[PDB]
mmCIF file of N, CA and C in Angstrom:
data_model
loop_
_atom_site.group_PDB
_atom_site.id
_atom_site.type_symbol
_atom_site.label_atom_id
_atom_site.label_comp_id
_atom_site.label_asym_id
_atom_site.label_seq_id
_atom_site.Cartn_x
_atom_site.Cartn_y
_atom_site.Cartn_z
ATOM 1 N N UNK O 1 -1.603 -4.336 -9.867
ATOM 2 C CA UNK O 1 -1.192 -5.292 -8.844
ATOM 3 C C UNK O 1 -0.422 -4.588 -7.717
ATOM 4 N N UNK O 2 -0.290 -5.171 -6.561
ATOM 5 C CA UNK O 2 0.230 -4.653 -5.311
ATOM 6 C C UNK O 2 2.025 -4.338 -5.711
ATOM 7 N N UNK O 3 2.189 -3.055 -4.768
ATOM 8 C CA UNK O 3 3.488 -2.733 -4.926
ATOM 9 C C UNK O 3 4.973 -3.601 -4.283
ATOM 10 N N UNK O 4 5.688 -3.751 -4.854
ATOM 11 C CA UNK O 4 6.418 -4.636 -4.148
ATOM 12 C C UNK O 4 7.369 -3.914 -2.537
ATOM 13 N N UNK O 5 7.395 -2.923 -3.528
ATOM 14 C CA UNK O 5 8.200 -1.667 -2.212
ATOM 15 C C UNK O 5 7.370 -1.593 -1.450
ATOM 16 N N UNK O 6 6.567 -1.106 -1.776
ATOM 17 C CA UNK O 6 5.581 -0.478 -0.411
ATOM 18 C C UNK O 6 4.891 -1.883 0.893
ATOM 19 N N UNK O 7 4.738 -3.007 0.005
ATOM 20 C CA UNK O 7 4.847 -4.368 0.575
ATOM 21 C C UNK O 7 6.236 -4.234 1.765
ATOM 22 N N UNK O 8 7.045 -4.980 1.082
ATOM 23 C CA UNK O 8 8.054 -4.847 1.759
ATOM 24 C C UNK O 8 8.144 -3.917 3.218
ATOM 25 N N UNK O 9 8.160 -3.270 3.098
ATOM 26 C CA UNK O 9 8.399 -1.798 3.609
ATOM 27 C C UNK O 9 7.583 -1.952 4.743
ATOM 28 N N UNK O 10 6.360 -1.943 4.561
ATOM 29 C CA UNK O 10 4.960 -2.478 5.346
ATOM 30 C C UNK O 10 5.404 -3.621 6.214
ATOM 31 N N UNK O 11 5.865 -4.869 5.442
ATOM 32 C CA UNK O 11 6.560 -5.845 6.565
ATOM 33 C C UNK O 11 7.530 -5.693 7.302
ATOM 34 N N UNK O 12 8.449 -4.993 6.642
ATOM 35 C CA UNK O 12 9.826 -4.756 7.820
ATOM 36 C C UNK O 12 10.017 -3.377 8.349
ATOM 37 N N UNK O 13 10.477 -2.547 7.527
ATOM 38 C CA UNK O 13 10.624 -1.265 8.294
ATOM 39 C C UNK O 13 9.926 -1.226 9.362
ATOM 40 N N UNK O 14 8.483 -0.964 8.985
ATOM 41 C CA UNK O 14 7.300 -0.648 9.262
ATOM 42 C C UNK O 14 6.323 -1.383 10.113
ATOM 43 N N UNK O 15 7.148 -2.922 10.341
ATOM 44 C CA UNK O 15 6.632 -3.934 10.885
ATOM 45 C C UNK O 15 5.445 -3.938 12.014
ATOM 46 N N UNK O 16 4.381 -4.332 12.541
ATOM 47 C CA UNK O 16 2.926 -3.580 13.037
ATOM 48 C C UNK O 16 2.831 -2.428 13.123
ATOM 49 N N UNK O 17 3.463 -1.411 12.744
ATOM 50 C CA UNK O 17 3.237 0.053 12.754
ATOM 51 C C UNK O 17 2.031 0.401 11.888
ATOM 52 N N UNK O 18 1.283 -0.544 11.721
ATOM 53 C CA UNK O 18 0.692 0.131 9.750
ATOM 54 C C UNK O 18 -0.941 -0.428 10.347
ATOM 55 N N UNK O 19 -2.153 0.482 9.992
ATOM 56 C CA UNK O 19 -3.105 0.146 10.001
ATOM 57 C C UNK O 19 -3.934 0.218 8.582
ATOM 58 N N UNK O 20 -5.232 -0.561 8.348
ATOM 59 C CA UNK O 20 -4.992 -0.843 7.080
ATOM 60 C C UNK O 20 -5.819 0.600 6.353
ATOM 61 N N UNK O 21 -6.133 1.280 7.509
ATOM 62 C CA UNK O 21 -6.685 3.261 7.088
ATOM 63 C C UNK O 21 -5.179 3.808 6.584
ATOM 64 N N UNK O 22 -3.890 3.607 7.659
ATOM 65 C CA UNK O 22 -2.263 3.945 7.118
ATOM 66 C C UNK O 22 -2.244 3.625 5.222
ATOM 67 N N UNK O 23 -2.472 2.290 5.117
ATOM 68 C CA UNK O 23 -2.294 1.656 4.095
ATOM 69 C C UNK O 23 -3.024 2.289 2.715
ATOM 70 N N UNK O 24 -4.368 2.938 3.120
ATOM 71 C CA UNK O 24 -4.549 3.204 2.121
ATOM 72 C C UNK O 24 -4.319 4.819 1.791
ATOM 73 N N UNK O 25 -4.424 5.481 2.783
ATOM 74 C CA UNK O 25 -3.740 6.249 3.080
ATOM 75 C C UNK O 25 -2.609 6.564 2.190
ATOM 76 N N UNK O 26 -1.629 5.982 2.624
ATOM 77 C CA UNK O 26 -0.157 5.907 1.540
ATOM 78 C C UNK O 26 -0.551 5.307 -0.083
ATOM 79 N N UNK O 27 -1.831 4.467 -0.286
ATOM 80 C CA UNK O 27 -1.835 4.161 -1.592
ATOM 81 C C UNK O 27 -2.335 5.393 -2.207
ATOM 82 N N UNK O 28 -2.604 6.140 -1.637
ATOM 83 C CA UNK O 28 -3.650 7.219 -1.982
ATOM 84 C C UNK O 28 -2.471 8.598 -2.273
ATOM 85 N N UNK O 29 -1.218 8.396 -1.550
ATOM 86 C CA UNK O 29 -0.037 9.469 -1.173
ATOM 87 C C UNK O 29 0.564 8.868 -2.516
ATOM 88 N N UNK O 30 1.263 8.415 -2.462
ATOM 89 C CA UNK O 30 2.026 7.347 -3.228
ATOM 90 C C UNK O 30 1.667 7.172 -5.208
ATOM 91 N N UNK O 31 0.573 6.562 -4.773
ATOM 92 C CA UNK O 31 0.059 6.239 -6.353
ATOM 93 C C UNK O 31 -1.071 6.761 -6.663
ATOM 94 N N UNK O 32 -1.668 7.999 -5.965
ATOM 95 C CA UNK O 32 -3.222 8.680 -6.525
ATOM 96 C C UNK O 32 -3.848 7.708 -6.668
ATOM 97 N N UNK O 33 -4.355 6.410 -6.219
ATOM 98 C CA UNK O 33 -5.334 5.637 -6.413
ATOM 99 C C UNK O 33 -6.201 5.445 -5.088
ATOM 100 N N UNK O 34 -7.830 5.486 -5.205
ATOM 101 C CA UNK O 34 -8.320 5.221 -4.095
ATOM 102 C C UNK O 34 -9.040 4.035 -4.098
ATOM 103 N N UNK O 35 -9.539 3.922 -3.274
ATOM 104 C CA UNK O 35 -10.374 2.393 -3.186
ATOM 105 C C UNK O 35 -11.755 2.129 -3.880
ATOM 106 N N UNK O 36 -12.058 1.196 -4.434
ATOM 107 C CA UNK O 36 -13.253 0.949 -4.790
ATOM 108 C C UNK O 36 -14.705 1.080 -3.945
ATOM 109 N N UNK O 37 -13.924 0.193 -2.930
ATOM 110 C CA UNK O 37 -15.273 0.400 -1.868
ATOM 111 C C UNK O 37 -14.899 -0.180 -0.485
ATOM 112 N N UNK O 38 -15.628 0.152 0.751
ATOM 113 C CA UNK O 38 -14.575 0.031 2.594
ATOM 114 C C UNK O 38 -15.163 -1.680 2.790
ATOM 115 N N UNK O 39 -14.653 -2.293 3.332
ATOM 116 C CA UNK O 39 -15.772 -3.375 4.108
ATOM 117 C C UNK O 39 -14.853 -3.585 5.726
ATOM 118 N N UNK O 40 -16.317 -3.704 6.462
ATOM 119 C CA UNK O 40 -16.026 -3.419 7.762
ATOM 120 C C UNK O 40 -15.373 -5.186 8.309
ATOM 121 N N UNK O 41 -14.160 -5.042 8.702
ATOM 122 C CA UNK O 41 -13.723 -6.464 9.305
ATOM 123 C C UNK O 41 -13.571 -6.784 10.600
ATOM 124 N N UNK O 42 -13.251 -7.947 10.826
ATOM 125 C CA UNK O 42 -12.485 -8.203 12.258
ATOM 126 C C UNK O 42 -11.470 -8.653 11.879
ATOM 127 N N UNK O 43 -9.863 -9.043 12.572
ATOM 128 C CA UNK O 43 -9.344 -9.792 12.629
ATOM 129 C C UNK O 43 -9.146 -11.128 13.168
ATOM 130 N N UNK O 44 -8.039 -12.000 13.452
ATOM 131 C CA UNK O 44 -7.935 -13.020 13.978
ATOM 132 C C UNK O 44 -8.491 -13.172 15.617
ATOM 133 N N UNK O 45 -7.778 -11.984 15.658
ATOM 134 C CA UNK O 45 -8.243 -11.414 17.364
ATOM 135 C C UNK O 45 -9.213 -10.663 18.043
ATOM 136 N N UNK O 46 -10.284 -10.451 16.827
ATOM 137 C CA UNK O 46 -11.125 -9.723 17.138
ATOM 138 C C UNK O 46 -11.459 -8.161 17.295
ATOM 139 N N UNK O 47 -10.459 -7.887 16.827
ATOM 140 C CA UNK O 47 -10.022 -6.407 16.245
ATOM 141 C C UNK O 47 -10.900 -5.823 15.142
ATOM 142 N N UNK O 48 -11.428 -4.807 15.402
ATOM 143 C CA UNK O 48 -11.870 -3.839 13.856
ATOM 144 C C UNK O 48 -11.410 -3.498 13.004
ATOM 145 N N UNK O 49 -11.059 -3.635 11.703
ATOM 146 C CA UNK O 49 -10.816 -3.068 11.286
ATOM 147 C C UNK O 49 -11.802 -2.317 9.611
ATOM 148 N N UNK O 50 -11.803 -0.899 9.184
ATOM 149 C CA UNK O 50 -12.152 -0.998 7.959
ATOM 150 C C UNK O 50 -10.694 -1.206 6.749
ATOM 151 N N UNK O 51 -11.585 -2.168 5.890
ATOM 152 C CA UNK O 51 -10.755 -2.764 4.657
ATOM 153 C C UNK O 51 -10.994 -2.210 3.634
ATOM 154 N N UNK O 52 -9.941 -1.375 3.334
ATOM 155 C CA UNK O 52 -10.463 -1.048 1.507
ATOM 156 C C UNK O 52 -9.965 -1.816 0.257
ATOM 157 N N UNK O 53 -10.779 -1.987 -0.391
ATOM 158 C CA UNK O 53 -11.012 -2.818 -1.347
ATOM 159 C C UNK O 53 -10.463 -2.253 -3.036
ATOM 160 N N UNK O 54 -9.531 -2.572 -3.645
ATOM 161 C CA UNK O 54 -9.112 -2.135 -4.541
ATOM 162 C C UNK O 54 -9.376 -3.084 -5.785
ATOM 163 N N UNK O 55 -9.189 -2.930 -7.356
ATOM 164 C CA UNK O 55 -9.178 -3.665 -8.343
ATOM 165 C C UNK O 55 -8.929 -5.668 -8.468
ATOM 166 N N UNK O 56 -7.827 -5.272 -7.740
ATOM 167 C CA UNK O 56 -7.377 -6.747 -7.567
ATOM 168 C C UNK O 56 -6.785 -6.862 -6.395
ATOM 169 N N UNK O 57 -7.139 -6.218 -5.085
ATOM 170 C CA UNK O 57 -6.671 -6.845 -4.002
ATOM 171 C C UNK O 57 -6.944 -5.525 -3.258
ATOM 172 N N UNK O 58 -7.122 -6.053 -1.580
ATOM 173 C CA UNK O 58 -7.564 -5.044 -0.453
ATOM 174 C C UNK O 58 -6.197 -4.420 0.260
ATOM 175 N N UNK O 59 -6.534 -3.593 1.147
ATOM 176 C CA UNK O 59 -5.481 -3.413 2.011
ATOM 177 C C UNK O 59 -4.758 -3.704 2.676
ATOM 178 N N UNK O 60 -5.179 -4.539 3.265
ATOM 179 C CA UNK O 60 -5.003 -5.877 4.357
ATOM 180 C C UNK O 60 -4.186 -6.598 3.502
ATOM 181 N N UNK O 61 -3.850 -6.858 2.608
ATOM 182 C CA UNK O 61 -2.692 -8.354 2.150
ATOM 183 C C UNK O 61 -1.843 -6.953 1.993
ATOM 184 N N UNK O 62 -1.508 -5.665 2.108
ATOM 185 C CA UNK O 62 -0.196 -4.976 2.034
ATOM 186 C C UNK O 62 0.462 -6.114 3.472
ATOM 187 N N UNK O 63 -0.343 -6.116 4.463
ATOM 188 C CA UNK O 63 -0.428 -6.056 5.903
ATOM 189 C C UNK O 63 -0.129 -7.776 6.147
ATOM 190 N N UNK O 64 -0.518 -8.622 5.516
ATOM 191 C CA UNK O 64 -0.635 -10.138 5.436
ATOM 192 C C UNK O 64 -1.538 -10.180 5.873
ATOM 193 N N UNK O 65 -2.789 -9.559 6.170
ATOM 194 C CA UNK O 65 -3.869 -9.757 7.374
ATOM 195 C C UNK O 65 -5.080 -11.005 6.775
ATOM 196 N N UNK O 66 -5.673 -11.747 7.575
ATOM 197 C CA UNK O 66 -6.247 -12.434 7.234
ATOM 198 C C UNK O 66 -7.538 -12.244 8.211
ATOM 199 N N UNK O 67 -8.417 -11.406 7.217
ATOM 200 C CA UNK O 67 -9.592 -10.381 7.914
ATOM 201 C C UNK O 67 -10.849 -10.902 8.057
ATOM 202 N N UNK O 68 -12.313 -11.018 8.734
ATOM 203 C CA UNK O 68 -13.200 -11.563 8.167
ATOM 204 C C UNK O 68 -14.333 -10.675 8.869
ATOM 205 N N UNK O 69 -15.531 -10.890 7.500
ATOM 206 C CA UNK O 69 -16.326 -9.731 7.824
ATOM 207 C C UNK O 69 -17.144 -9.520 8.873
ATOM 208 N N UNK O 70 -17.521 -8.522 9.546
ATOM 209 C CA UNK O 70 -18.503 -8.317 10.651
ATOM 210 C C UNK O 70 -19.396 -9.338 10.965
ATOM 211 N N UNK O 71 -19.704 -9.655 11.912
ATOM 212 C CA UNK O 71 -20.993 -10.122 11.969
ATOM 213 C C UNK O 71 -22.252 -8.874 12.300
ATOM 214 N N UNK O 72 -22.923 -9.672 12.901
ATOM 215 C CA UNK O 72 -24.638 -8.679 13.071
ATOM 216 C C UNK O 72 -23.851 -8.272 15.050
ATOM 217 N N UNK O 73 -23.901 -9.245 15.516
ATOM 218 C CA UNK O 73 -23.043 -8.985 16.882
ATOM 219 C C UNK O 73 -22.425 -8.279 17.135
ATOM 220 N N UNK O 74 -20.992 -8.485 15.902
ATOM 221 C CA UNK O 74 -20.144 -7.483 16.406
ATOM 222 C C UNK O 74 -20.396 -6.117 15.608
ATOM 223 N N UNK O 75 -21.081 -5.897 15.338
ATOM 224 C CA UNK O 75 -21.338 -4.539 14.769
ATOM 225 C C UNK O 75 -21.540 -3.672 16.519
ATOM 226 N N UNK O 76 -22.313 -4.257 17.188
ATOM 227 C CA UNK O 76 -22.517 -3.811 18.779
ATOM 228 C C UNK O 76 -21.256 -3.251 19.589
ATOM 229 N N UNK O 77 -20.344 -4.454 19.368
ATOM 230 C CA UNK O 77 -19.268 -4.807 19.715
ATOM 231 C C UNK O 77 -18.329 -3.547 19.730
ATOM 232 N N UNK O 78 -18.121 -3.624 18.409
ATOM 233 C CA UNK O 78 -17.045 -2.341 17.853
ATOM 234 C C UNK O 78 -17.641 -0.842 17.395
ATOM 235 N N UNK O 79 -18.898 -0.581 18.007
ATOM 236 C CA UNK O 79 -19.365 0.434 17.669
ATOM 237 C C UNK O 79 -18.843 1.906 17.668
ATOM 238 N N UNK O 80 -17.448 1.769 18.172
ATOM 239 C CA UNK O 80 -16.691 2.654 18.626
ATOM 240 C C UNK O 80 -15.695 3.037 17.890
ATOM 241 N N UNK O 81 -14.929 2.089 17.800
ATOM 242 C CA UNK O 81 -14.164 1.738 16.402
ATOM 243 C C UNK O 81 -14.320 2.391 14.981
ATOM 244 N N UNK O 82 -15.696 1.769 14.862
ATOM 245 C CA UNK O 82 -16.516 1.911 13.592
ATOM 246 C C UNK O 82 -16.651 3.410 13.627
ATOM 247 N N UNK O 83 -17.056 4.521 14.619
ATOM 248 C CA UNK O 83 -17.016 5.501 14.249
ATOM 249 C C UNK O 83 -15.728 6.381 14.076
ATOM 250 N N UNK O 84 -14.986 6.240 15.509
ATOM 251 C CA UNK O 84 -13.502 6.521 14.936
ATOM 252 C C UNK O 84 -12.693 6.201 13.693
ATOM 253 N N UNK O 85 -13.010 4.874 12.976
ATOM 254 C CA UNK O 85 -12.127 4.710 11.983
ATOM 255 C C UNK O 85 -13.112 5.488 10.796
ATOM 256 N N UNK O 86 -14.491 5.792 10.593
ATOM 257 C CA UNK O 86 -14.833 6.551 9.693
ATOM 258 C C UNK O 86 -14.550 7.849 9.521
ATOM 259 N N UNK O 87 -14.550 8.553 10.811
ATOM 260 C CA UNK O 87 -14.089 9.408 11.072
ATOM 261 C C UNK O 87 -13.109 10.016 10.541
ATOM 262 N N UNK O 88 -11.968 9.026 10.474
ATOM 263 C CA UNK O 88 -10.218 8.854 10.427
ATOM 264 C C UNK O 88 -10.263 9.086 8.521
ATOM 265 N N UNK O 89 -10.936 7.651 7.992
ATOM 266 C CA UNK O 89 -11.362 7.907 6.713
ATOM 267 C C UNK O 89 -11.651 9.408 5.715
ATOM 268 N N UNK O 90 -12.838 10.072 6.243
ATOM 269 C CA UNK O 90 -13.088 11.406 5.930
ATOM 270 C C UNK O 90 -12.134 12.353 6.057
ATOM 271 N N UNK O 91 -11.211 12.258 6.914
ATOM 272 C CA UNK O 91 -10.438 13.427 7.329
ATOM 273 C C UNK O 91 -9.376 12.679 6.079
ATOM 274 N N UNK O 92 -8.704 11.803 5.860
ATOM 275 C CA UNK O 92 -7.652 11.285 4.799
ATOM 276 C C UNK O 92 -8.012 11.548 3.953
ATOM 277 N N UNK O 93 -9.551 11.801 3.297
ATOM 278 C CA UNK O 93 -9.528 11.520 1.901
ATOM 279 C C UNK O 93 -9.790 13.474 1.619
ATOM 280 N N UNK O 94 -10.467 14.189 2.789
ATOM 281 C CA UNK O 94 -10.189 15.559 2.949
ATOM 282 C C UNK O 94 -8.891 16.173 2.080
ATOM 283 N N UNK O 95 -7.966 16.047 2.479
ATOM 284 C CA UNK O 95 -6.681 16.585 2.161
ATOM 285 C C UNK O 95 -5.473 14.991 2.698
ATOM 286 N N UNK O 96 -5.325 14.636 1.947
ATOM 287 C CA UNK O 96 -4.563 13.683 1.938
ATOM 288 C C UNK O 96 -2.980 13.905 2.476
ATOM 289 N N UNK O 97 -2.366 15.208 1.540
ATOM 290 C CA UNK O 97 -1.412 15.914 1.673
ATOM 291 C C UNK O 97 -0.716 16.148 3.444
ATOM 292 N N UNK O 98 -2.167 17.051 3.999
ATOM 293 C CA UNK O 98 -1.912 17.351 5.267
ATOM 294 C C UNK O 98 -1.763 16.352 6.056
ATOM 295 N N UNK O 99 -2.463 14.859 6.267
ATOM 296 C CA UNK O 99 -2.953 13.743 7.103
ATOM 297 C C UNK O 99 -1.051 13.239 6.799
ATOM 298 N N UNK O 100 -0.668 12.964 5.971
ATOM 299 C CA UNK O 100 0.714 12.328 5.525
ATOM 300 C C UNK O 100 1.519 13.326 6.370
ATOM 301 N N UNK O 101 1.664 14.836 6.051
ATOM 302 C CA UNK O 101 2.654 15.422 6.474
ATOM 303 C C UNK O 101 2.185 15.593 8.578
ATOM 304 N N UNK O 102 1.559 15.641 8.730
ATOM 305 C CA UNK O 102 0.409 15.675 10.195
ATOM 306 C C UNK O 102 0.736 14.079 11.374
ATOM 307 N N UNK O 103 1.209 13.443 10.556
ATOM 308 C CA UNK O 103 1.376 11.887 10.918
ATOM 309 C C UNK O 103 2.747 10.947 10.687
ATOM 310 N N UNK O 104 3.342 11.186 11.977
ATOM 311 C CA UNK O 104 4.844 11.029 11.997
ATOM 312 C C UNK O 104 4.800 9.479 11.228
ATOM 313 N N UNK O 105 4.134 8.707 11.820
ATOM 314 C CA UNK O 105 5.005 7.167 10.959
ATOM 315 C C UNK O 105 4.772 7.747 9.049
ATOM 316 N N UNK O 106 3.486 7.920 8.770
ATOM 317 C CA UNK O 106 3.312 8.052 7.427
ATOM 318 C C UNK O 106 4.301 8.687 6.492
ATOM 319 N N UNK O 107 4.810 10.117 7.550
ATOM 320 C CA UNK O 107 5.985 10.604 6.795
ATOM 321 C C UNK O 107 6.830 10.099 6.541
ATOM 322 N N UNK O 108 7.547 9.104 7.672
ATOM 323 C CA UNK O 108 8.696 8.599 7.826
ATOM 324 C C UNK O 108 8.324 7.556 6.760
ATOM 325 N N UNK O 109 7.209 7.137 6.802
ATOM 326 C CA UNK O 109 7.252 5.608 5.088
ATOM 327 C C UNK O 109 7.391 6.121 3.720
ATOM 328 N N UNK O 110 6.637 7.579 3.695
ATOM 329 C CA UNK O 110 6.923 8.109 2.434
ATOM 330 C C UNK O 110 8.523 8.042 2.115
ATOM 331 N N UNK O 111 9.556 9.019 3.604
ATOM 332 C CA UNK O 111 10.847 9.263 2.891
ATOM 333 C C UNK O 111 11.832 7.935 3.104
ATOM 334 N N UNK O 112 11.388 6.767 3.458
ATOM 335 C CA UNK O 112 11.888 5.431 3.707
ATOM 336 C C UNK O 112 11.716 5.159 2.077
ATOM 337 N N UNK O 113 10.324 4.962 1.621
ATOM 338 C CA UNK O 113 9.901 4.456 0.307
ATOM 339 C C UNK O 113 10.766 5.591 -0.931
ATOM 340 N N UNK O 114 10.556 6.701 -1.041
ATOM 341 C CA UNK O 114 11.126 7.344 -1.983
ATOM 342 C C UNK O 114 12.570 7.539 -1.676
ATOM 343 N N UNK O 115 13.255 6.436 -0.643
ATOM 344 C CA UNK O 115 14.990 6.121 -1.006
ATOM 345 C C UNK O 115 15.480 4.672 -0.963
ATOM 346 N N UNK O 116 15.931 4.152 -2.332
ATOM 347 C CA UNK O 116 16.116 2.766 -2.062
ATOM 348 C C UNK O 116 17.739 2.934 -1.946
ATOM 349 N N UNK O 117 18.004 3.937 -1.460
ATOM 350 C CA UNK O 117 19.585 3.919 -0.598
ATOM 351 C C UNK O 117 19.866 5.463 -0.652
#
């Protein structure tokens, strides 16, 4: 089940700083777990995003996001997106290590998360 810290953390510290590639990203830093499988979304606003999909819950509820899947349209739409954020994907799951230490907010959530004072 989802972390309560890293939740948290995600809402306030971290408050829109976090994309849901960040998110898994850090689940991946954090707890060695990766995703089951990506699905390509939009948001409320029409935003891209890819969602990874875990055991019992996606990336997006770290985030509160309330995501919904592509259409055939917007696949056109965000074609840009879609390659940058795969892009982004490959290089994280590359060396995970480097992308965390390489990426100022990520660092800063790791040493936020590993001090609860």
């Amino acid at each position: 089940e989802m972390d309560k810290r890293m939740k948290s953390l995600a809402m306030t510290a971290f408050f829109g700083e976090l994309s849901t590639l960040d998110i898994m990203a850090l689940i991946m830093s954090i707890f060695k777990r990766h995703p089951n499988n990506t699905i390509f979304s939009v948001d409320k606003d029409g935003q891209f995003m890819i969602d990874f999909e875990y055991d019992n819950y996606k990336a997006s509820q770290y985030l509160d996001l309330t995501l919904t899947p592509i259409s055939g349209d917007e696949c056109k739409t965000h074609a840009s997106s879609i390659a940058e954020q795969l892009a982004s994907v490959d290089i994280i799951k590359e060396d995970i290590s480097e992308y965390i230490k390489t990426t100022p907010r990520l660092k800063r959530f790791i040493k936020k998360y590993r001090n609860r004072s």
